[PDB]
């Protein structure tokens, strides 16, 4: 809205970054990471002259992805869970 070309700026490198896309119900999207730079359209228009490099430009095997599986699976309660806490009280006497 202010006219700045950069959407997000002053972003700390931190641990790293990964391409990601969250599709909704009945939604279809083609995620082209850039294994085939020829298949990367509009890259010459934006990115080629700016110095940007295709993601996985020289990677031989395709980049594996991780979909958010919706299957409800039991996992242990985190020790630092913000709301629920599990206490390991000792048996002592007259108590298990």
């Amino acid at each position: 809205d202010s006219g700045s070309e950069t959407a997000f700026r002053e972003i700390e490198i931190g641990d790293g970054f990964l391409p990601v896309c969250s599709l909704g119900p009945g939604q279809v999207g083609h995620l082209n990471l850039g294994q085939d730079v020829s298949s990367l359209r509009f890259f010459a228009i934006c990115g080629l002259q700016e110095g940007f490099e295709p993601f996985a430009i020289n990677m031989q095997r395709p980049v594996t992805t991780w979909f958010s599986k919706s299957l409800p699976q039991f996992e242990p309660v985190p020790p630092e869970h913000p709301h629920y806490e599990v206490a390991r009280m000792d048996g002592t006497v007259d108590t298990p």
Binding site: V37, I45, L48
Partner: protein, 959 residues
């Protein structure tokens, strides 16, 4: 929030200490500064009782209310998102409806007190921002709990005694029956509380231990609780609304008495009045004890209509259980059908501003009468005039500024976040605009100090008008009023024509800018199809004819006024929905008066039944195309043809773009939609020829100095430059940018000679070159914005397929850029021109698609950089950095070229670098790339030029 109770009590006590009785001025200042500084940082929800106290006491408008209302407006301006936005203020929660109704009551109490009280500079000046802040903060779509609430007015709890008031027996039967019924329901609550209603007093149960059945219960000990219920019902019937049974006649009761359900809206409003009675009548004794104690207003003894929902429930529940007992028995309280829109904040304050609008019409009529009849300074409505001028005009300005999205919010396409304004709200806000226009029609002479305020406020009311829904399916009086106001404005423009050969001052400063803004709004929202028609279209016809006649006439005053006519007429062309420039195919257009009106209607309106007979003054669009083309060929300057550039160019640059969408080339939405042939036969070809004429006249007028309207000409050509033909670049921009480049090169050569000399003549020559390329800066700030949009459209085309002419244009703009970068005088004179002519704003809008720091030259260069960056191979990119270090050594272009020729063998290697593999493969995959570009001369040329561009870019970014 953990222990906010004592924070609230601290706020209350600090406010009392500030409103103490024996304090010094400095001490009072310290207390008040603490209060504002504290409430600025605390959460707005912590003001639930301090805000209530302010609602109660600030409408007194005493000398002690200065800091109260100042802190009030500071807090509300801080948390305008907390109330107006339905989502709240981010992490902070959403406002309560109780707080919203406190805001409403506070706003209107301050307004009415400011109304009756006499004008005083301090209160009005320091309270108008407060009133605007409360009005803006409270959302317009909010509806109060009840429009017909109590609205009553240390507090005085009005004792409405009813023991003396007699009760008709036909209803007194169920008054006594409900007294017994509430005793039984009290016992039912006790037994429901796991404590069965005892018959003997015993501490084993915390509840009432002596609620015996009615047979064994003593009458007096019933009355201990029964008489309060009887007096409750007796007070409720003693008020003018008397509770009347529907059916004639009349230790647990069979029907459950629950206050959760609700009766009719009126019944709920005066049950709220009954709870206000529980406060006043039943706590006059409490107020006597409280005045004996000297503890200030007790929390319940605060007026009930302004009390917080959490603690007013103590009497709300009692009033509601009484009214619900009446409701399940069918009893109705006979004593108003207020619509939801009237109930709403928006339309209520709208009716009130209409009331003050007729009051101010009377006031200004009397003021004009006493101005005309001698000099009568004494005015019976002087307080009203001062109130209007100092409060009402800024208030409507600010309120319409912060809620213009709401008043413009179409129900079909919701624009306002809070909601959409009602149709009645839209129509009478349009009528308010028309009434303000009629008021200031000849009042512009008086209210001289407030005249700019009037014109800006009426600009705001001109913006955000649903002319669509008021003229179509809207009130006949209001639509006739606006149509007659446009007709009178057209007659006024004709009078203005006669004058060029108050009213003249009106047309000079108030009529024309507001008319332009109205046309601009109608053009943006494309409302003209159902708005600019019939008599409105006729009035616009005579307006355009008369201002064309004004353009024809040539005098000094009309020359100085021509920018206003050009802007106004461009906006009316953009809001004018019939192609009057296509008279032969006017039957195809369904918006014209001839097809909308019947033949009899045309006869009684005096219509010529043809566009040609309507306006033969303006020739056809082909004729003005030929005229502007001939003027371009002849090189018509502003001296030779000022009216053309001022007024007739807006015709083309406004009507032609918008009607290109109606032209044949633009694809129709459907075959039946396109079955009527387009009334305008315009395509992109005539648009492109119009750009050619504009470019030709600009380059011919480039040498002309003191040309100012050329900037607004560039602004007017900002939309036309889009959808430009590819050949237009080498047709027009390459020659004129070449001329600009060579003239700038001559100027910079003179500047270099000036720099090498150091005499007293060198200082005069320094001022001379400053003034010599100030015009160059103006010309570049004209031409380059046209290039910015042009490269924006064709950058994809040039990058997908390289154009040699595009590369040469890149070299041209890069040469201009290095000329601007090397010379310090260039940058300071550019900044001086920007600050002189306020170019920062228009540069900001030019950079915006669809600033002082921002350098147009740099921006243009960065946008065009990829075009002239793709011309070189990646192995040449592997030579750019050494050429940059050559330029870092401050060496000459000849030497950097020679030692680049020495480093011809120092280029990078594709098998050397893995990234060069894919970069070099893509550089081959470019369709316009062959192997002939690998010639060493071409390679060194492009390397040197690209490196010069990059080095001057990085020096501009980081000196």
């Amino acid at each position: 929030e953990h222990r906010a109770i004592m924070v609230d009590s601290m706020l209350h006590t600090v406010y009392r200490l500030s409103r103490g009785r024996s304090l010094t001025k400095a001490q009072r200042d310290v207390i008040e500064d603490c209060l504002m500084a504290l409430c600025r940082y605390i959460r707005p929800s912590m003001l639930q009782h301090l805000l209530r106290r302010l609602v109660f006491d600030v409408p007194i408008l005493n000398e002690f209310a200065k800091m109260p209302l100042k802190l009030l407006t500071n807090h509300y301006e801080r948390c305008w998102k907390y109330y107006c936005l339905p989502t709240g203020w981010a992490n902070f929660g959403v406002t309560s409806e109780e707080e919203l109704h406190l805001t409403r009551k506070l706003f209107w109490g301050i307004f009415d007190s400011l109304a009756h009280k006499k004008y005083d500079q301090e209160l009005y000046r320091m309270a108008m921002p407060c009133l605007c802040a409360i009005a803006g903060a409270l959302p317009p779509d909010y509806v109060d709990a009840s429009y017909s609430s109590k609205a009553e007015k240390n507090f005085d709890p009005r004792p409405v005694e009813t023991l003396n008031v007699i009760i008709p027996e036909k209803l007194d039967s169920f008054i006594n029956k409900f007294a017994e019924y509430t005793h039984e329901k009290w016992a039912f609550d006790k037994i429901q509380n796991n404590w069965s209603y005892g018959e003997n007093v015993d501490e084993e149960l915390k509840t009432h231990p002596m609620l015996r059945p009615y047979k064994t219960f003593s009458e007096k000990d019933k009355e201990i609780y029964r008489w309060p219920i009887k007096e409750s019902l007796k007070a409720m019937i003693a008020w003018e609304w008397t509770i009347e049974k529907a059916r004639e006649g009349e230790y647990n009761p069979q029907p459950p008495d629950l206050s959760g359900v609700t009766l009719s809206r009126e019944l709920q409003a005066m049950a709220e009045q009954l709870a206000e009675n529980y406060h006043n009548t039943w706590g006059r004794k409490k107020k006597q004890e409280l005045e004996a104690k000297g503890g200030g207003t007790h929390p319940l003894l605060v007026p009930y209509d302004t009390l917080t929902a959490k603690e007013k429930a103590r009497d709300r529940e009692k009033a509601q259980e009484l009214l619900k007992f009446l409701q399940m028995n069918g009893y109705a309280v006979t004593r108003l059908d207020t619509s939801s829109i009237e109930k709403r904040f928006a339309f209520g304050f709208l009716q009130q501003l209409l009331r003050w609008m007729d009051i101010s019409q009377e006031f200004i009529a009397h003021l004009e009468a006493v101005v005309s009849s001698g000099r009568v300074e004494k005015s019976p409505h002087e307080q009203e005039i001062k109130f209007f001028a100092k409060i009402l005009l800024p208030l409507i300005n600010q309120y319409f500024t912060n809620h213009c999205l709401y008043f413009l919010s179409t129900p079909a396409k919701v624009l306002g976040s809070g909601g959409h304004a009602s149709n009645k709200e839209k129509e009478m806000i349009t009528s308010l605009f028309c009434k303000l226009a009629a008021l200031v029609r000849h009042r512009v002479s008086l209210f001289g100090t407030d005249a700019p305020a009037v014109v800006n406020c009426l600009h705001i009311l001109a913006r955000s008008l649903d002319a669509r829904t008021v003229m179509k399916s809207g009130p006949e009086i209001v639509k006739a009023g606006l149509r007659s106001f446009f007709e009178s404005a057209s007659e006024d423009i004709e009078k203005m024509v006669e004058n060029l050969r108050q009213n003249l001052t009106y047309t000079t400063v108030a009529l024309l800018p507001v008319l332009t803004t109205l046309f601009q709004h109608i053009a943006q929202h494309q409302f003209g199809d159902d708005v600019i028609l019939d008599d409105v279209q006729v009035s616009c016809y005579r307006t355009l004819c008369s201002i064309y006649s004004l353009g024809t006439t040539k005098n000094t005053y009309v020359e100085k006024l021509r920018p206003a006519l050009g802007e106004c007429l461009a906006r009316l062309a953009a809001a004018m929905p019939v192609a009057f420039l296509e008279p032969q195919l006017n039957e195809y257009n369904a918006c014209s008066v001839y097809t909308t009106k019947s033949p009899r209607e045309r006869a009684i309106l005096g219509l010529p039944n043809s566009v040609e007979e309507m306006c033969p003054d303006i020739p056809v669009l082909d004729r003005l195309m030929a005229d502007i083309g001939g003027l371009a060929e002849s090189g018509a300057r502003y001296t030779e043809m000022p009216h053309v550039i001022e007024i007739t160019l807006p015709m083309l640059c406004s009507y032609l773009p918008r009607w290109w969408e109606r032209g044949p080339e633009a694809p129709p939405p459907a075959l039946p939609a396109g079955a009527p042939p387009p009334c305008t036969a315009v395509t992109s070809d005539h648009l492109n020829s119009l750009l050619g004429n504009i470019l030709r006249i600009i380059v011919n007028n480039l040498g002309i100095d003191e040309a100012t309207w050329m900037k607004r000409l560039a602004v007017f050509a900002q939309p036309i430059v889009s959808r430009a033909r590819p050949e237009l670049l080498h047709s027009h921009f390459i020659p004129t940018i070449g001329r600009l480049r060579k003239r700038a090169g001559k100027v910079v050569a003179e500047e270099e000679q000036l720099r090498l000399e150091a005499k007293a003549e060198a200082e005069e020559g320094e001022l001379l070159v400053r003034d010599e390329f100030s015009v160059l800066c103006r010309d570049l700030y004209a031409l380059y914005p046209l290039l910015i949009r042009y490269v924006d459209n064709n950058r994809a085309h040039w990058l997908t397929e390289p154009n040699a002419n595009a590369e040469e244009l890149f070299r041209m703009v890069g040469e201009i850029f290095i000329y601007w970068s090397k010379s310090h005088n260039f940058k300071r004179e550019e900044q001086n021109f920007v600050v002189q002519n306020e170019i920062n704003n228009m540069s900001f809008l030019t950079a915006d698609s669809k600033s002082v720091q921002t350098s147009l030259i740099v921006a243009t260069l960065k946008k065009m950089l990829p075009i002239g960056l793709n011309m070189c191979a990646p192995t040449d990119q592997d030579l750019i950095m050494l050429a940059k270090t050559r330029y870092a050594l401050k060496d000459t272009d000849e030497e950097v070229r020679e030692f680049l020729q020495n480093n011809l063998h120092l280029q990078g290697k594709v098998e050397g670098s893995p990234s060069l593999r894919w970069q070099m493969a893509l550089y081959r995959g470019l369709p316009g790339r062959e192997e002939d570009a690998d010639d060493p001369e071409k390679i060194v040329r492009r390397v040197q030029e690209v490196s010069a561009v990059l080095y001057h870019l990085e020096q501009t970014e980081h000196p």
